[PDB]
Structure formats: structure tokens, C-alpha cells
Amino acid sequence: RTAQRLKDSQNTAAMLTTFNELDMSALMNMRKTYKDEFEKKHGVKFGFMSAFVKASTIALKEQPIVNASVEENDIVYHNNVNINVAVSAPRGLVVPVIRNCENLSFADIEKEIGRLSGLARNDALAIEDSIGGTFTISNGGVFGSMFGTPIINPPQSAILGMHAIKDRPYVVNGQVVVRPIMYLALTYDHRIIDGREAVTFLKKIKDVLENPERILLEL
Amino acid sequence: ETRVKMTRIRQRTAQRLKDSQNTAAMLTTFNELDMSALMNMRKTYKDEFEKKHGVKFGFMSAFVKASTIALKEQPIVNASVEENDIVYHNNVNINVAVSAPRGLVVPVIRNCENLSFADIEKEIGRLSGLARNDALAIEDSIGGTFTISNGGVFGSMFGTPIINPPQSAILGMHAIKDRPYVVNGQVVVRPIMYLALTYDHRIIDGREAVTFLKKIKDVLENPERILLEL
Amino acid sequence: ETRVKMTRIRQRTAQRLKDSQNTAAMLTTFNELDMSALMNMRKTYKDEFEKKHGVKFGFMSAFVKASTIALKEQPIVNASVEENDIVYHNNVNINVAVSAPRGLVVPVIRNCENLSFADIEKEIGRLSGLARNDALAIEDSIGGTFTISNGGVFGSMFGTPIINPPQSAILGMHAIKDRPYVVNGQVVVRPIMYLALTYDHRIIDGREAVTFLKKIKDVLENPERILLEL
């Protein structure tokens, strides 16, 4: 059933992928500085998922069509922002749905991720818990993928592909320096989303990431 | 030499300031703040901000956000004393000192707990535009629970502000100046800002005020702390 | 919105603070202190002191000794002002502020004029243990002649504290931080403590207070000066 559903997703949506680079330095710097304080304040670790969720929600507020889903003959825009997150389990990858992420703060996102992961490992996740998403953030970098072409979760139209951070040569002020970089993937449906929407979406995502102050400034 | 009978408006002002002195145990604590990071991000992103929302990125919004967070950590300071009691306010309302055809006037910004930086600037601009036009309704100055004052626009190093009744605390802003400061154990030229906090000691002890101000200073020293509600 | 009837005890406290405000001419002077010498001495001999007297070497004892010496140099400040009379105290009875489960409690240390640093630390630990157990008698808070407050444990740069009545002056301590400071004509990183002295101007002029606090500063800059009584 899973394989046939993935094949149907392949046949239905015009899946294609674009890519961007990301100097992840600033966010991991602030995380390394404040992780102890954050964990002591909210009783939960400071991972990486929450920042990407916040950036995706913001940029999807900037991109109503990407939040929307394509159906039989219509586009169903969403007043809500729901994101599926890929997490490993004793039965492999499972995608719980995070709901109303437009209002969740970093600590709340971490709490949601922790409780849903605890449900996943214990296999106490209801099937309805994986229903309702409008977008998906996959993280292949937990195993060490350089970059790839992830498959969208239908009926959604776009997905983010995380990848392993590694120190690479990079240009800062015209100087070759050692920079920890993550490569990003964006598989999306071209039937309703042209290339320009996807590239602007992902570029805005990137800009948000390298400067976390931009979330503070909603820029 | 010459005599000038004062206006009854200023008589009311002086009398209510004296009432403030007689009612609340007026005292002040102080702190220093290296504003460097905040002005760096402001100078870098002000063009983007003003092109995004049509309003220039000033400085008031950062203080408003810091005060809202710290008051959320300090329910007593947001509250006020009314002759036998404390009325804790479930909402955050801040009076802001802004110049006018008369000068300092204090409009009230309401529900700042939810208000974001760009919208803070929009609210400030709207009320201060009412200020220039002198189209400020009197009730616009009614409803505040705390006051943020700016003496630094004129260049005070630090002073002692007076709380607006019936509030129990006020913050006094002061001019940014390049002063010697210690960074990683080295003397460096750092633009520093002096912060004064005048409050009532009848209900707020020194510990609450100092924790309030220290938390505000830490919050402002790193906007990422706002980003992480730390 | 939400109301809480104030406890009669804390209303009594607020009213006593208001009485102290009205009765005494409240004003504050300030001096700066390079704690480096005492800090180095403590950092060197704290293990020896703790092993010898079974109690760590805090900071309080040095301030207590300095205050007792300076009060002996200043017969008026230790005295208390009453209805119509100066009550000159032959004995030095300092008061210390310590945090409590009930807020802030201020015990009284008596005849500190003869206490040695080890004995001062012993008394401090004894009364702190009483406070933790909440086994502090009410009479333990009476009999004072002067008071020392510690706002620096919570991180105040400097500020104005309020004297406990009927005392005429108090010292306000503040957080030690590394600031630029001129030493032998060179700007160097120095651990500096800001000192505030709130006093009554009705019987104490500016000169007595400033000489008192400057003398304390000089004494604390070189702890050997106590040994030399200079």
C-alpha cells in the first residue's frame, strides 16, 4: 500500500527539485551558547527542527499557494499551517502532524516534537495523529546525506530536505574560510507551483536561517 | 522680580506629582547596558524594515518588548496598589514619553504582550502623529500600567524619573555614549546606555526591582534571548 | 481586574517604610571601590580560614569591621535621632540583610566593635541558620544602630536603598564587575564595587557622610589599614 501510494504521488504531481546552500554557522553558534539555558528553562533540549519549522511557517505565510494543496479539480488553500516531520521509530520513519504551527514558539515546538517522538518510540501514536498536514520537513541529514530528492507526502505539494552539516570551503567577504554548511532540497509540484515561487520560497527560507534576527524582525 | 500665576493644569500636574511622592516609596536602582548588538542589527536591517512596513526602525520597540517579557516574569510590577490592595493587571499597558507642541505627553500602548516590533513602531507612529496634530483624545493617556521614559533624546547620562500614577515602576532611558568597557577582560571602546528604574518600595522590594532590571539588561544585550523567550 | 487584600503585616511594613520616608531627610552619596586587594586575600587564605574556624570566609566580615571602625571615627552617624534627642550609642549594633522564605529579614549583630572576622562569620552563619529554620526571635531584629544591605548578590550596579528606622544611615552594596579603571596612570581591568550611602540630612550634613564613606573606601582598599588602625 505504501509503495502504491508513493507511485500514485509520483504520477499525480509534477515532482521536481531545486537546491540551495546555507551557512548554518550563526544558528548553531547561538544554540551552542544558549542550549543549557533553554533546556533548563523549558525542560527540553534545543534541537534543530524548531527553527526550520518557524522559518517554513513564516515563508508559507509569504507563500499562500505552497501551503495550499491541489485536489481533484481545485486548489484548497489553508488558513492553518500544519507540518509533517519525519522521525525514526521501531517501525521506521513516521510523520506526525504538527498543527497550528503559526503560533507555536521554539520551546512549544520542542515540547511538541518531544511528546510526539515519545509517542512514536512507544508506538502510542494514533493514526489520526499523522493526518492533517499541509507540508513536510524531512531530515535525511540525521544519517549523513549530502543532498537528495525526497518524495513529497500527498496530498501536499512541497517538502524540505535536510542534510548533514559539514565544514566546507566558503566565501566570506571575498575570503575562502572553513564554514559549516548544510545543503537544502525542495521537491515540489510544478502543476500549480512554477519555478519562481519555489525558488523565492527557498531563498527566503535561507535568508531567514542565516540571520535568526530576521524572525525577530519578521523580515 | 516679575510674577506669573501658573495655569491650573500645571497646578494639577505639580499636585499629583507631590501625591506620587507622598504615596509611593520612591527609590531608584541602576544598570549599564552595552547596546552594541542591538544597534548593529538595527543599522544593518533598518532599510529592509522601513521598506517592509513603511516605518523606520527606532529604539522604543525593543524596550517595549523587553518590558513586556520581564513584566510577564514579574506579575507584581505590572500591578498597582489602590489604598489597601494590589490590582494585578492581566494585560500589559505602557505609557511612552513623546514630545509634542507642548512636549512630554504619555499615550498608552495596550496589549503590548502580543504586539510585534513593526506593529509597535506603527502604534508609536500613529499615537505620535496624533501628538503632532494635537488630536490625542484624553482617554489615550488613560489605562497605562507601566511607563517607559526617554531622557536620552536630550542627553542625560542618568537621572531619577517619577512614576506615572497609579503605576509602581518607571524606566528611564539615557543617551548612548562611547565609554571604556571590559570585553573578555580587555578595555575597549563600547557604546553604553545607562538605565534607571524608579519604583515603589512599599510593595516592590529591592530584589524584585534588581531582578527585573538585570533580566531586562540581559534580554536587550542579546535579541536572540527574545527569540528564545529566555 | 484581579484584587488581593494586603496582609496587615505587610501593610504595616509599607506604612513603616512610609514613616521612615517622611520622618528622615532621605538622600544618598556614593563612592567606588576596587575590591582587588580583599578579593586576592580571600582567594588565597579562604581554605585556611574555613579549615581553622569551620566556616568559609565571605565578604560580610570586612564590611562589618570597616563600618565599626568608621563609626568609631564618626560618633554622630551611629547615633539615632528621636523625638527631640540624639541617642549616641556607645555600642555598635549593625544590621544585616539576608534572604528569607518570607522575603527579606534583617537580624541584629551586637557589640561588633570587639568581634573578629572569624567571630563575625560565626555570628552571620548562626543567624542565617536561624533564618533558614525560621527560628529567629522578634527580639533578634531589635536593638540596631546601623544597617548594611546587599543588593549586589542579585546583581545591582548601584542604587539607592532605604534606611531602617530609627537608624540614620545605611550602606548599600552592589555587584562586583570588571570595569576599566586607572591604576598608576594606566587603564586596566579592575574588579570594582559601587557603594551607596543613604543618610538623614536633618542631623548629618554632607561632610560627615562623605568623610565616613571615603574613609570606608580607603580602609577597604588596603585591609592592612585595619591592622594599622589608620
Tab-separated table of N, CA and C in Angstrom, chain C residues 13 22 30 57 68 81 83-84 102 104-105 107 111-112 119-120 133-134 148 181 191 197 199 208-209 227:
chain	number	residue	atom	x	y	z
C	13	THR	N	4.420	46.943	57.315
C	13	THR	CA	5.767	47.166	56.797
C	13	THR	C	5.801	48.360	55.850
C	22	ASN	N	8.986	59.884	55.498
C	22	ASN	CA	8.563	61.216	55.928
C	22	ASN	C	9.478	61.780	57.009
C	30	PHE	N	27.787	58.531	47.179
C	30	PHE	CA	28.342	57.339	46.554
C	30	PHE	C	29.861	57.414	46.512
C	57	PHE	N	35.136	32.050	54.446
C	57	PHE	CA	35.440	33.472	54.577
C	57	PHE	C	34.651	34.211	53.500
C	68	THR	N	32.417	49.418	61.586
C	68	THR	CA	32.624	49.669	63.010
C	68	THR	C	33.737	50.685	63.232
C	81	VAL	N	18.374	59.456	65.817
C	81	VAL	CA	17.602	60.672	66.039
C	81	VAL	C	16.193	60.270	66.459
C	83	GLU	N	12.499	61.788	68.982
C	83	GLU	CA	11.526	62.862	69.154
C	83	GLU	C	12.180	64.232	69.263
C	84	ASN	N	13.116	64.383	70.201
C	84	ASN	CA	13.829	65.645	70.339
C	84	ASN	C	15.308	65.466	70.660
C	102	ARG	N	10.253	34.149	53.728
C	102	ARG	CA	9.222	35.169	53.887
C	102	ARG	C	9.622	36.492	53.244
C	104	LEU	N	12.613	39.259	52.903
C	104	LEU	CA	13.874	39.753	53.439
C	104	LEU	C	13.732	39.952	54.939
C	105	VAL	N	14.678	39.412	55.701
C	105	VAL	CA	14.698	39.564	57.147
C	105	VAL	C	16.042	40.150	57.552
C	107	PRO	N	18.393	40.553	60.766
C	107	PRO	CA	18.814	40.366	62.159
C	107	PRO	C	19.736	41.490	62.609
C	111	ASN	N	27.532	44.538	69.567
C	111	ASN	CA	28.919	44.683	70.009
C	111	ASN	C	29.899	44.193	68.948
C	112	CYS	N	29.647	44.571	67.693
C	112	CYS	CA	30.567	44.235	66.613
C	112	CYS	C	31.905	44.943	66.764
C	119	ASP	N	34.754	35.531	64.271
C	119	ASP	CA	33.566	35.652	65.110
C	119	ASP	C	32.407	36.277	64.343
C	120	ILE	N	32.697	37.257	63.486
C	120	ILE	CA	31.651	37.860	62.666
C	120	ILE	C	31.036	36.813	61.750
C	133	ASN	N	15.826	28.003	59.446
C	133	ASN	CA	14.883	27.277	60.283
C	133	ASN	C	13.660	28.109	60.642
C	134	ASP	N	13.667	29.406	60.327
C	134	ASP	CA	12.622	30.336	60.758
C	134	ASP	C	12.492	30.349	62.278
C	148	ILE	N	23.520	47.415	57.019
C	148	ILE	CA	24.227	47.184	55.765
C	148	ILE	C	23.359	46.283	54.896
C	181	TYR	N	39.615	50.950	34.682
C	181	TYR	CA	39.958	51.738	35.855
C	181	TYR	C	41.417	52.152	35.756
C	191	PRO	N	38.309	44.774	39.243
C	191	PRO	CA	37.021	44.425	39.857
C	191	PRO	C	36.555	45.552	40.766
C	197	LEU	N	25.447	55.297	50.062
C	197	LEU	CA	25.226	55.622	51.467
C	197	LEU	C	24.029	56.555	51.555
C	199	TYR	N	21.427	58.494	53.947
C	199	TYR	CA	21.533	59.014	55.299
C	199	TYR	C	20.501	60.108	55.518
C	208	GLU	N	30.045	64.927	56.872
C	208	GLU	CA	30.201	63.742	57.709
C	208	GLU	C	29.981	62.470	56.903
C	209	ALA	N	28.933	62.448	56.078
C	209	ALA	CA	28.644	61.257	55.286
C	209	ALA	C	29.755	60.973	54.284
C	227	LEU	N	44.739	46.737	60.415
C	227	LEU	CA	45.826	46.267	61.261
C	227	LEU	C	46.638	47.426	61.815
